[model samples]
Target chain A: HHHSSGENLYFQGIWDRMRDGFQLQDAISTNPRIERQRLWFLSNQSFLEQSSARGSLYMHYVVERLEERNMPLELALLPVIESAYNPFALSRSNAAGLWQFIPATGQHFNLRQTNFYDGRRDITASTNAALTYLERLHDMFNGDWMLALAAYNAGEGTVSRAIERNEKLGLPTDYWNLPLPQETQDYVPKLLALSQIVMAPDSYGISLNPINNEPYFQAVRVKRGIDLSSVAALANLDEDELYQLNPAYKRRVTMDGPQQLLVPMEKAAFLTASLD
Target chain B: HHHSSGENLYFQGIWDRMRDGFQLQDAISTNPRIERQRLWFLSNQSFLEQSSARGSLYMHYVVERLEERNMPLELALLPVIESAYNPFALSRSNAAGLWQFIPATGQHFNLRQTNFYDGRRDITASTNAALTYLERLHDMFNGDWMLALAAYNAGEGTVSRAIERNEKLGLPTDYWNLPLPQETQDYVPKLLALSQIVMAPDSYGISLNPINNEPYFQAVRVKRGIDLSSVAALANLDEDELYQLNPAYKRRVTMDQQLLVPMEKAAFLTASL
Candidate 1:
């Protein structure tokens, strides 16, 4: 194994990136109940810390995709509420993966679910699909974030009906006044709470999550039909780390074209040199 | 003629009415969650006390309606959750009156909301409408009372869609297993908790709301276009009392054929008329 201090320097780049590109700050105070719900989740900070640590494994990529679309970076923290950043977090409603896209929504967004692979659990594919879905919703609600969020939790039809009911009575039609399903009422609140915690963990008696501001992982093309362990051996990375970072591969084997492996940023160049 | 002891004994018969028909026991449960929710409302007992006292004003008549349909007496407490038995309760969604019926639902059930008077505010009419809606939902969900209550809070469409989702996945399709909205999830639980509390108030550290177990109201068929105050005067009752029992009359005048007065005063009005 390489020297221990040499290994320490490899993780240093991640923390540096966090300070520079904390793009979620403006959306932080956009929600006032942020601190109230933040206190509730802070009571379960250990659980949140675990989720954040898992999030660090994928957030760099999520933020990048959000930035590419000029989307709110607060959207990156969404997975904390959606799946607690766990790729395998399947919900009671059969919503799967970090973004919690049900099969129907996932299919509509072109995230394939096959016997060998679920695109939902693929960090690269799922993040792209989630951004696309959120952008579509943002436009559909005429740029009202709250109604768009309510639609995400309930459905567009439910939101439309609520709006229609308000229109009939000449009532002010806004998210605050609409009679949304209670879960939809709390969905955005939970996301905003998580965003506030990320914005200022210290104020909430929580410690910094040790994710750097730089790329935590780098995607690299690998041979088709290759066992993950063999790929890890080629990169000189641990097999478990490979599985943890790349969970979409069923049977621990990468299948067909567009199959890629996410390796630690420092190891990408070495792994790339070794691949050919 | 007005001895204090005699007046007190006259009130004793009210409590006796409770035991005479006490038909809501089997529905009581030993579940901790029931007790948990009961404790929550107990902590907010002041709110519930006011609600319960308001409920007492109409409970006797509500129980009568439940008995007529042979429906469970536990349903008499539904308004305790819906609007604290307050006839004026109006939700942000435009669900108004004692049963909190939305305008569309109220319209569907023949509860007319006109510029002059909203039928949803009429205690007798809305209670019948609420019972009919509940019965329809119970039947629609194949006799699942919990699902029926959930459909009441959400909608029939919502509950059916959730049931279908569960069925397709080979999952157990019970109310608890179905993926209902969170409000719908808590709606049945709240009602059950209230039912358990009503069954045994002492068990939850709540003072028994002195809801007499006798018919508190007696409907008098009065001539249309008659002033409500005149009918109350004929019955030797207060106009406010008449209004509380028969809120459907938006004005001091009665347009409907039936108007309810206090049970004891009905005979006086009958004799006077």
Candidate 2:
């Protein structure tokens, strides 16, 4: 690592060598496992077209926030693996949003899941919590994205134990070589493979929608629970669409209580109007 | 699962205590992941107008075949994680197909990767190989799907060692309780997560594409080291499109003697014409 450009010139120096000059090809070539890593970029639009514009906007917000925190752009591709960019994506554990944070984890990050609003789908809050947690993971692992990612999925304690075992075995700290849980072991590579595509879409021959790089949705603080269906009805948008856009109301009950719930840009207009 | 009405009845018995079912109400209530999961289904145009037609179709074929073998429909979602339905999706060391089978594993299951054809990209061939490998893993791991997925990602031998190590350390194999590698640890959950989405599209709110319930492309036996570009030109498809459809050919050169190239319906028709 020290033999080449690494100090602030990782791109012009290290990438070139690590990618080619230092024969990463030979190393990766011998090991088909590393090379065989396949990452799906969620390039398919089957799910996205059905999405509310609010979903689109929130996805953009969360992804951009991850970028702001210097999280590897590849992590943003994780939404592809999670919700396929749907704001209303949910799992059996009540995991939500593009990142699929479960309520407990979301709450741990201070993303409240109250009857009025669930921070799991609150774009601004959830994005902040996810990145902050990731930053914390990065620090805990001493700046290793792979280990941090493992902790993100399985928890830091799991990674620490694995590292402890590896230390006993005298293993290298290299992400590729580290022993890990099966899913976590390959999950990082899969995410990395996704990064390869989103980062250089042309190389992978996949093209993204010509989404304008702008903030699509804004968050407004509603101190009390408000009825989303009513707000959506007044906005002339479908309630299902509203529910799809504003997924913070997990019960679909009337939104009441002081919490920031997401509303479509269309509903945002009506929300202000209804409150007045 | 028992409550499932339509296509999900195929796996009717599994819903007994599936992890994601209880959250369906709450997920739909406020979770976009749940909503989007319900909404994100495959589209007709998603197969055609999208970048690689053959790639996606082959995924459908493999997924269907795996299901036919009585493998969990969940296993099919793995190909999405593996190659995003790319038929010729290969790692540099020659891991191939939607499943990313290495050459040895490919051959172990009778997938021929000769100069003419690589079974790794052959939809029918690779699916069988993958099943064989999965079955082997299940056998080794004592019918544990989570363990099977882990062994599939890493080797079964590696997994066995890890289990033994953990046993020595008095760690448990019950996922939420074990100490494993970072990637291997994440592997089972990711697979389970993907499985959840595919199992009950309604619960996740993702719509699947109405893929033709069979192979969309037929294999043509080529007998030379021909450039993929030349054959694609004969087929009247763009070069990258061809590569995107079939990623097995290293360096655009069919390294096989019997090059079994999977051509799309229109391209095949045009080539025959």
Candidate 3:
């Protein structure tokens, strides 16, 4: 293989390895099956390095928060797959942030979405919500990661009903060969595929860049309403850049809430002191 | 032009209005710069009556709820164009539901979106939330429904900023010409188009068999954590049908919370009986 000459060899490598670990075909049993699981993979790689760097920066911020809860760092990549790590990738369905939280899920986790901010689409708030939601779902569904992913896509009730439906029909409750929605069947595998890709680059016939999971920023408490644009100015970061850091904010303002605003350590310190 | 589009019109109207509304350049925009606004109007009125009706039923539900709070019903139809009344009309950007509540807006209105239940797409919850949010917005933005609707789409911060920007620039801050995002710029006209279509369908060559807005069934207070399938069995109807009336209870059992289940009138007393 002309590994050096081939474009997207790195990404392709990761993808190939992921293919090794799981049965994508086994997961997608019914209609609209695995149509284009990695269809956007290539067209995206040129910018992937730069984007991943930006994403890695956010991943670091997210893992730092996730670490406070003692969760696995690998879970950070889920956002990259969910929204290309964009905090403001507002889906028409209004799913937001790296975790692609719809409004309801965001609120359930106490990540409030207001006219000023949408916690679901906010990268930090959503990542926190996704991880918590994932943790709870993981606890509920007996530790089947794939099943947890399914629950994430279709909701707990729908997944539980499926388990019931399959049990009643005398089928195994495992993801494979069980009844599931078309979107969810693919949804779980996509997460797995991503996990596979992240695990190894050489095995999948691609050479992917190293993604470091480390903390990027600190969480700052802003008790009063503060516009994100101003925080960006104080942080010496662009407003849009600050937005990527705090995507859940629907508007530019960070209203007083439990899931307070995130800013760089230096800026956070400066703003806190400056407020006095 | 066909005046008698029977039940088949259910399907045909979607395409008819879509073409007629979209195909025309509608050259009457006196100001050509505003042509895009007119285009958005016609394209959005692409009501696709059946699709619109599905969402409109929910729209009416929200509209009625907001009216009880003394809200302008015109604000209720904003969701018509925002999501085509689809609860889960996710754009490539992931803005969800009728009124297209982003995670932030949905959160503001207490519409919870989970892997379990996306409040953004929750017709019942989102409608209520959207109405509540809009009512509050109307209160804040000078009691002008249009300005509030504009603020709703463009963000209160953006709208307020635009107003400040207008004041600085010595420009009028009317709803129509406010400096706004492309999406927000087109939003006002879409609301007006629905207003036009609703007030005088004969002029637009559109007609709708009015869906009865009566409360055929209503929320039945029930203890949480009982499966909806059981509720269906108790009500002597399919669980799916029962689920249809009560989407808020996605888990069926309600779980750790009280549930409001809607029971059809004929079978209203079944749960208690």
Candidate 4:
């Protein structure tokens, strides 16, 4: 829900839009952890290639929202590390969706989970919730994005305690200096590495295929109790395609919660007309 | 937290305390669904018997809170239907604790779930959340306790839709008359039947062993980051017993969350002193 019209800053692709907003460039050469991760990504380019393809469906909206918030646009690539932009990704700890929120944290941010819907996997809802959580963490860690990213992977409590321990010992209380879980230690570096790659894909000899700079999906308000299959058929789209945008509706029917569907932008008019 | 000390209304057992506050007597006689449920409980009395024993640890607090809220005392028996009063109960749908709240509903009620804590299994926290949820549902359904209970089992949306359907069809919209799911259809009647059994255990040839009316556990404010095992040792409590009262702490250590412990009253003095 942002201004997408007018003299738009012309970009060849969503990746270009994201690269224009990159703010963490200096951190690339400063840390060996980041260098290690950058090398890993270079060697394993297929992961980035696959994630980029999967991420195309939702990257425009993510980049737009990031730019709106004035947040580091590199966050748009977070889903690549989080779930490879897969809406259906669920972790062993029960984190779900493109953002990988565990149930408790998801609920803390008002992401409603129910029999019919899991807001943790809802593209729009989860994105907003994840941003809210990240923003809150950012504030809690005194505007340190690195610590906030670490807190996102591990619970805030874990990160807070690590910071406290470092403070008492009179050690440098930065994300790199703090004793964090192994997963959390690598998490921030991984994000920074991907950011570096996105910043200069050609340097790494990796080609991130172009995705339209326009909105890929548009939110369509619908009445409750409508079947998703019916909407897909009415819109003349494949059911799998419909589910990719609306994987949060577990039962394939819209129930009494956030009664809206994310339809492909081109098909929204057809779906809207048929529903009427 | 409630007024536990005073010229307390003396009772022989917690069941008596619960029975004195019974208000759903009329519903027991009006419906065959309740009768069927009553008979099922009557025949399968061991389920009640086992649940009663397990419920003993938390019954006083549940009954006390119900009384303080002026809620029907029959609600204290709800755990028997929900999780058999087991604090560690987990359902297939990821509903956990004595109340069996799924993740979403638990979070909706502010029952925090994290790597270290699951408020849905926390004896004190889950009880408050469940009561708050039930109270909200009761208000939503216009003070109909039966509808509220049905909504609890089948979700408010499901019950609301059922009520709407019945209203459009000009059919009776009461809990019994609505075409509810089979689980929900039996859910309300099961609670009512348990209420009936508790109301008159003798007539049903059931003997409910006495549970002391006094508080069973006392809340002790403790600093966060304390290991429960250390608390168990400090209080000279078996680790299992400590866990029984404080099952919400998943890692056996308290982390940044509600920083309190529910210790048995007899041991509370020993634990704290």
Candidate 5:
């Protein structure tokens, strides 16, 4: 099994771990759509370079969360496509945060939106919601990950209707054959192109920045109404960096919500002790 | 005289107006530091291109603000260097917003930081505070805009101490001669280089996206506790675009202080009505 491979033990970094856990190797195809997307990515290499630098802050936790659920680790790279790994990225369609959850979809997935808190942008909360939603989509599509990803992009109902239309016409009822929207048509191919690049970046002349396998941050429990500035001082952290990590908190103070703070792993013990 | 010239009447865009109001032309020199900084900017042309694209959303308002204060119009491009015109930009040293004010400096200028609002990120409030601070610095430094710009990057006290050291040594007490942090040293030159580029982008082979002289957005009176969603629906504005223009609002609802809505000029009448 790939999991039991001794080679994994000698893995140098998060990229190595991710490359090993990739189960969608078949998706890395000679398909023209994926090839076009891959070429686009190759030409615009700086986009990936910049996204990887930003992803360093949060991708470890994303990989960890995906691994815990035994899900495809390639999903860890989804935010690179979604928000360019920017937690504050907001779309013109009103999609907010790393996963780009629109208000309705965010609410449907149990991500709260309140005056003081936006769980859709909460690092921990939104990741959980996205994974859960993706899992549901995966199960609903009967083991076809391509179909599931298409559903994730263009709503399950839209994908279902497209599949039904293909079924009625006695045609293949797969993502490639489905009459999906232009954006949804390109979405899965984009992910596949990115996956192929990560899998063998040398072939594409892409050099990814090294992100260590160790955790970048840890979540520590804190009381409601706890001020972030005080926490920053107690943990000897930059206030701006703290805010970047815990951007869900609209104010400087933690309100009535997920009473947790994400601090750099090194500072977690100090913050926990001071809070206690 | 440039402002009253007939050429002003035929100005095509905000760039024309800004070029006319350019007062720091002397700073555009072959000083090695400035040359190096300008070369860096020329090489990293994408940075300015991206910044200018983002600035188009807000630069008109910034230019209008500077004009109202009769400040050097080049100051409108300050955010291009500070935050790349990203209002949500936060620095490593706790500076937030387009003007990149740290908490203490923000408070000193009467920018309220409360649970519901951050005046530092408020488009209108922060611009006013930054201008006020810059104006104060300009006066304190005996009308030297370069000194004031340096003081904005490093604190006023830091700049003053550097100037005092230069005075004790009987050296030139101008910004160029003063001892400053490496970042502060590059800071003024970076702005000057950017100003020079904006003044004559053709010489640098740079193409800045056109920003019209007309206001992009207008602030309309809003009520406390009014929902932004409702306003978006009423004004036929995109909620996300509205939020982009008014990033200071942490929530979907308006809170106490700064009861104004920054709506696109096209939507202003609809929003006002």
Candidate 6:
């Protein structure tokens, strides 16, 4: 079949890829409050772009992982809304990391919470765990992504009970019809609204900062635990970038074992060579 | 004060001066809701900028009126948070216009709601009435602006009862310590936070679109029962812009005598008359 453009194709950026794969139907609310929210996001697209730039080293990886799982790539934007891609972001509810897992939920997902490490803040581990949790929610809600999203915001029990209540009252059980908490009611809509803005940034008067589809970062395997600073010196790289990637290591060094040091793609080979 | 690294003084916008003269205490809350609400506004700065740009045609008049009454210039920013300075803002509870007054309160303030006019929607009338109500509240609470503001959100009766209850039960009776409803609790802080942002918009990484230090409109007395469209035609102004300024008119015709036209256009209507 001829390409859609009917021309020789060029590679798309990670954002472009995600936009193309966005399966979440934009059922943005007609509610005036939600419209006000939409306006807020439209105006603040620059802030979102600025925040998402902090995750330039991480989001493409999340997108690849989502692709591996055959999931909607829109899941990659979760961190933008959750922590604004700030791994150190700590909510008052004690939810931590890009995926915003609370202590109990992190432990439940086998995201270890020792003094030296917080898996909830781990780039790969947290992404995997969050996707797994989302997949589980998607399944538990009988493949209703909207219900699953509601469950993600307000727990599965809350969503299930809301659905059951609607059933008992002979009411339709879509997201719009369900009587959820006010925040939860707004939560999914906010995500969808954000997704719409992200998908068509220019349409909403947003100019996204340039981020290419290339592998932004790479993982360098180390034989043993190493000080973050020493690795930074060895790679001749900025420690801040390394620290952002390895934020799960709460201490100065990585834990003992074959722990991989996540670094920018440019520095990865040099670090691996220096270690070798 | 020394001229801090200043060249000759440049012409500042009316909005700039209004922002500089803002004297409201920044009692922005550390509450999570405040932060959440703040983020909502922060992201929507462009929307606020656009909305404030629209208000340029009208707000200088309100600012002048506030100055005339010697009221805190901060009160001028109230409509920024209340109604985005939209003259025709009507709330679900029938709180109408820039001040968001319900029918009874607006009526009590002598804002006559006629078949052809709603004084609550009139720019000058509503501002005068709102300031009167606020000044009254300020007095009722013994010159406490905070208590007066709380009363503005959750009625004077509610605030007084809460104060009375606090007095009886040996609790702190200040606005910060009182047990107001959730919404009323947020209302004051939201206003403060918005005012803070509006005042030091550059610090918040947003620049407010400038409205120059000049009167944007002219008030003119029209003959009774004159058609608003005819006046709009005479003045060579957009009918929608006229409606936006004169929303107090309940119909196509002006029942009351006074109408406001943007300054440049007002001369045409004046010349025609």
- Sorted into a CAPRI-style docking class, model 2 comes out as incorrect
Against the true structure, what is every candidate's RMSD?
A: 30.1, 26.2, 24.3, 26.0, 26.0, 28.9
List clashing residue pairs in candidate 4.
none
What lDDT would candidate 5 get against the real structure?
Answer: 0.77
Kindly list the per-residue Cα lDDT of model 5 for residues A1-276, writing each as its tens digit.
132111232456989888867888855657799998999999999989999988888988888666534468789889988998888888888788888899999877566778877877888778867876786677678667899899988999999999899999999997888999999999999988998999989999999998987667766666656788888877779998888888887775577456568888667655655663
lDDT-superior candidate, 1 or 6: 6
lDDT of 1 by residue, B1-273 (tens): 101111222344333333333454565455564666777787887877788678777876666555434356667778878898899888999888888999988777667777767778888778766876776677577666778888988999998998888989999987777777777766777878876666566777767656654456655544346887888777578888888887877776656356677766654553354
| lDDT (10s digit) by residue, model 6, range B76-139 | 8788777888877888888888888888787776677777777788887787667767866776
The stretch of ten residues in a row with the least summed lDDT in candidate 4 chain B is B1-10
Model 5 per-residue lDDT tens digits across residues B120-200: 887877886787678667767877888999999999999999988988999999998988999999998998888999999
Per-residue lDDT tens digits for candidate 2, residues B70-125, read: 34556655676566666756778677887888887766555566665565775554
Worst 10 residues of 3 chain B by lDDT: B1-10
- Candidate 2 C-alpha lDDT tens digits along A10-110: 23221122222221112222234434564233444343333323345554554444322324545555665567667578888788876779877876655
TM-score of 2: 0.41
Cα error of candidate 2 at position A53, Å:
8.9
Better of 1 and 2 by lDDT: 1
Give the alpha carbon lDDT tens digit for every residue of A1-276 in model 3: 011111111232232322322323343343323324443443455444555666755754564443333344446656766677766676787777778777777656655555665546655445545765775576577656667778887889988998899999998888755678787877765655545445554555545555532235555445455677666676576677666676555555566334346565435445544442
Which runs of model 2 end up more than 4 angstroms from their true locations?
Answer: A1-35, A39-55, A87-94, A114-117, A223-225, A266-276, B1-273
Model 6 reproduces what portion of true contacts? 0.00
Task: Report the TM-score of the second chain of model 5 against its true counterpart.
Answer: 0.91
CAPRI tier for the interface of model 1? incorrect
Docking class of 5: incorrect
Fnat of candidate 4 is 0.00
> What's the count of clashing pairs in each model shown?
5, 68, 53, 0, 0, 2
- Which parts of model 1 are misplaced by more than 4 Å? A1-36, B1-273
Model 6 chain B scores worst on lDDT over the 10 consecutive residues at B1-10
Candidate 5: regions farther than 4 A off:
A1-10, A251-253, B1-273
CAPRI-style docking class of model 3 based on DockQ: incorrect
The C-alpha lDDT values of all candidates are 0.68, 0.54, 0.55, 0.77, 0.77, 0.72
